[PDB]
Amino acid sequence: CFAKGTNVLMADGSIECIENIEVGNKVMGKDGRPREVIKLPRGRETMYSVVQKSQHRAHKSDSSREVPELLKFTCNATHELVVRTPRSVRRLEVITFEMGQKKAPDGRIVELVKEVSKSYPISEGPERANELVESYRKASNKAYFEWTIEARDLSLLGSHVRKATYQTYAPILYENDHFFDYMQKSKFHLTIEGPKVLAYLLGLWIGDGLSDRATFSVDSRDTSLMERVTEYAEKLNLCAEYKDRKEPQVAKTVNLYSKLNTENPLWDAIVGLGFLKDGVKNIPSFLSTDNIGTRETFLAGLIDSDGYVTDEHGIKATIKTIHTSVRDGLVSLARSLGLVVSVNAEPATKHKISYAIYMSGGDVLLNVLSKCAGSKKFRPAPAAAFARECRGFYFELQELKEDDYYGITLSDDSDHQFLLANQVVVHN
Amino acid sequence: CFAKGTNVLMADGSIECIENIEVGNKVMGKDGRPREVIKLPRGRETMYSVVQKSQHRAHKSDSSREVPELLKFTCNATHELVVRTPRSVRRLEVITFEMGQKKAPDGRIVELVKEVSKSYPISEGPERANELVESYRKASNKAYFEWTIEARDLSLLGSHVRKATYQTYAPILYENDHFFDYMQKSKFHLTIEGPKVLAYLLGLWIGDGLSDRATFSVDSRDTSLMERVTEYAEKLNLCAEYKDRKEPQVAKTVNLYSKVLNTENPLWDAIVGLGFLKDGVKNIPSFLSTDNIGTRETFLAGLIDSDGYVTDEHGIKATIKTIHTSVRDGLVSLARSLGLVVSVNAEPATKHKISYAIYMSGGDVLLNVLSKCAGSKKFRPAPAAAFARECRGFYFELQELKEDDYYGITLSDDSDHQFLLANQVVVHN
Structure with missing residues (x-):
């Protein structure tokens, strides 16, 4: 149901092109748990590309610097988009968004969210109106409809419903311990200290450090930061040497020696873990x-x-x-x-x-x-527990036609959805 | 109990200087309901200025071009600020924001919000750790504390708590109907849809209208918006004439002529009549x-x-x-x-x-x-259900000032003892 080359997220965090996936394989479910591929549908069908709706756009030339907003893919016409649309009711002519149906041009009846209106004589008193809105309000436990629409059927949506309809991407809940395992691969587990402490300093590195030594700027800005860089460096048995500035009275130099900056555990990590690429910083x-x-x-x-x-x-x-x-x-x-x-x-x-x-x-x-730890940067942790939810994104669909498509069908026992490499929640 | 000239929102939506309020007057409560004044506390005390934290401030006997900071007021040293602080628990050594107590330089013990840490033993398990937290999470339905603190005791606050603490302003739930009354009392127009179509039309005019007649711009690429203008100008008994270009090809000019652009038409009369064109200059x-x-x-x-x-x-x-x-x-x-x-x-x-x-x-x-x-990229569906228009917070800077006279008001014995300043900020008597 996807175009050749479509990158999907495997149950282990690895990316894989749709066409290279085999039966038995496991893709990533929105919950961070695997989904087993049982069959691989193949065929030819008009294709459609889905692209996130922007505002400030131009990318479509490899002349570089054109932001590649990851959220997009190409699927066949009958591929089902996993979409959401908010519930809505206006007045009390009470207008609501409701699941309904419409005959497509080819005769098929499609279930889809529709803008609905009901109106009666002002004369008849507001009784029927309030029962309508209250009724609508009792009609569901969610403030949105969650459903699917095949790519070829999106054009059937009325304007208001079409514009309010969005797809979603899921957070990656699956977790690996590579940072941990790289730490074990350089002497390890004996005494506290972990990956968050290293990750923090590496974060500082990308932020404003030097691309040729385990040294970065600090000075002030947020001031309180310094006590933490020493405390964190200390936790990694390193050492923070502060020098004479490193930016017009706003930044400093902090060298993190091994209790150096070259034959060191941190710059090993830097270029070792991939934070320094082609002479440039990268996460x-x-x-x-x-x-x-x-x-x-x-x-x-x-x-x-x-x-x-x-x-x-x-x-x-x-x-x-x-x-x-x-x-x-x-x-x-x-x-x-x-x-x-x-x-x-x-x-x-x-x-x-x-x-x-x-x-x-x-x-x-x-x-x-x-x-x-930075003064103008810290904000108190949340009040209560919180779920990392799927975020929505508005998109534009484009008919392309032609082409061969590649699909994977998950077990029927499962919720037939998985994640593309860009985190977009897709169906079979 | 504030500085002279502090404008208070009266129960009828009007505005009055605090030194002009008298016993028996009713101020605006945050629910849109009145609050009666029972006493008038006067005195001389050290004063504190509260101002919202922004890059603005602006006019003091000068020009209006700079954006001013309107959320502010000058109160006395002992005046209680109505503030909010989010609740928060961190790590799973656990830190939380809690209602606590502290002693001031004088005798006074003041209840305030405090950051608090909890840590101890190894191997005991996910007991106390994930416990302190889950507990904290069930502790309230509210994700913030709602309390008061005198201006002078503000500096008793810890740094995290202080920066996380803010004041609030409330929407104006109270409704006069001077607009409908203008219409009904005026020109020639049956309503039901009237004040809606008029207000809308006055919105478009304020947005991009000529300052001397009933003409404005409308996106030419937008069919439904053009339809809307026609439909509403019609309801007002006006006739809408579109003209190619009211901006180098992007907008169309719309002329609103009376049915059968200044005289004998509802739109221009309301513009002049309701004060939207205040002596040659546009105004809201x-x-x-x-x-x-x-x-x-x-x-x-x-x-x-x-x-x-x-x-x-x-x-x-x-x-x-x-x-x-x-x-x-x-x-x-x-x-x-x-x-x-x-x-x-x-x-x-x-x-x-x-x-x-x-x-x-x-x-x-x-x-x-x-x-x-009606604009294609402007419209968004109405809410999914009934909503509440809640108070909105704002962070602020407090500055100790001169000792000067103060003018306060006291509300009914047992009531929330809170009212709205003319800028909507929620104050305690």
């Missing part, structure tokens, strides 16, 4: 399926050196970077936690393009900021 | 903020449909751009009166040295405005 892919607390700590560290926290219309954290490797790696990482992300190519020693990355998520973001 | 009249809610909402939908944009990105949000200082100020107050979160940002462009971008958010509160829009 690794394993991160996205690692331990959640580790992911949050790496992020807390990154927010601490080069992040901007805001409260105005909800918490939001912003990171600017020129490296596309960092950009792409951060969007993946944040999304795996269940945060909402949007990048923005904007203006900018002298250099061309700069990337602004904003993350939101309420309690999900509060869980990250609570791990920060 | 104050009455609007204490008027019928549906009307305030429709008017906003009109503005949004005219010179605004909606984004879903990180939460539903609407932005309205205006080059007019008066529209800017009236808009901030109108939006807050509904319970929307609002922020203004000064921006760039013969040309205009500066324009103002005003951002609005507030989940269902905003969705109720948007569902009245």
Whole structure:
């Protein structure tokens, strides 16, 4: 039901092209648990591509710097989109969104959400109206409809319903212990200290450190940070040497020697784990399926050196970077936690393009900021427990036709949905 | 008990200087209900200025071009601030925000919110650890504390708690009906749909209308918005004439002529009559903020449909751009009166040295405005159910000031002892 090349998420965090998946294989379920592939449907059908609706767009040339907003895929016409639409009722001419049906041009009857209206004489008194809205309100335990519509049928939706309809991506709940295992692979388990502490400092590294030694800036900005870098460095048996600034009276130098900066455990980790790529900084892919607390700590560290926290219309954290490797790696990482992300190519020693990355998520973001030590960056942890939920995204569908499609069908015993490599929740 | 000149919101939506209030007058309560004044505390005391934390401040006997910070007031040292603090538990050594106590420099023991740590033994298991936490999580239905603290005791707060603590403003639930009354008392127009279509039309005009007649812009690419304008201008007994280009090919000019652009038409008369064109300059009249809610909402939908944009990105949000200082100020107050979160940002462009971008958010509160829009990318369905227009918080800076006279009011023995300042901030007598 997908085009050749479509990357899907395997039950182990590995990415795999739809066409190379075999019977017996296990893909990733929205719950972080596996889904077994039992058959591999193949055929030819008109295809449709799904692309997230943007605002600030241009990407479609490999001339570089065109943000590759991961959320998109191509599927065949009969492939079922996993969609949601909010419930809605207006007045008390009470208008509501309700599941209904419509005959398609080819004769088929399709079940779909429809804009419905009921109106009676003002003369007849508001009795019937209030029973309508109250009734509508009792009709469900959710503030949205969760359902599916084959790609070819989306055009049947009326405008209001179509625009309000969105697909979703799921946080990656599955967790690996690669950070842990890399730590074991350099002497290990004897005495406290773990991956969150290293992840934090590595976060600081990407944020504003030097790409040639285990050394980064600090100075002040949030000041309280310093006591933590020493305490954390200390936890990793390293040592933090502070020097004479490293930015017009705003940043410093902190060398993390082995209780150096080269033949060191940290820069080993840096270039060893993948944080330094082609002479440029980058946040690794394993991160996205690692331990959640580790992911949050790496992020807390990154927010601490080069992040901007805001409260105005909800918490939001912003990171600017020129490296596309960092950009792409951060969007993946944040999304795996269940945060909402949007990048923005904007203006900018002298250099061309700069990337602004904003993350939101309420309690999900509060869980990250609570791990920060920077004065204007820390925000109290959530009040209560919280579920990392699927986030929605509005999209545009495009008819393409032609082509061969590749599908995998999961067991009937299961909830026939799994995750593409971009975290989008898809059906068979 | 505040500084002289502090404007209080009266029970009828009117406004009065605190030194002018008298025993028996009724101020506005946060539920839209009155609160009677029973006493008038006067005195001289050290004063404290409360101002919202923003990049703004603006006018004090000068120009209006800078965006001012309107959320503020000057109270005395002992005045109790109505504040909120979120609840929070961290790690699973556990840290929580809790109601506690502290002793002031004088004798006084003041109950305040405190950050608290809990840690101890190894191997015992997920008992106490995941316990302290789960407990904390069930501890309340509310995700915040609601308490008061005198201005002078604010500095007793820890750093985390202090920065996390904020004040609140309440929507204006109270509704006059000066708009409907204008219409009924005036010109020529049967209602039922009347105040809705008019307010909407006045929204489009404020957004991009000519300052001397009933003409405005409308996106040409938008069929349903053009339909809407026709449909509503018709309900008002007006005839809408579209003209190719009211902006280099993007918008069409719309002329609103009376049926059978200044004289003998409902739109221009209401513009002049209700104060939207205050002596040559556009304005969003104050009455609007204490008027019928549906009307305030429709008017906003009109503005949004005219010179605004909606984004879903990180939460539903609407932005309205205006080059007019008066529209800017009236808009901030109108939006807050509904319970929307609002922020203004000064921006760039013969040309205009500066324009103002005003951002609005507030989940269902905003969705109720948007569902009245006809613009293709503006409209968003009405809420899924009934919602509450809750108070909105704001972080603030407190500064100890001069000793000066103070004017306070005392509300009924046993009542919530809370009322609204003219800027909607929730105050304790």
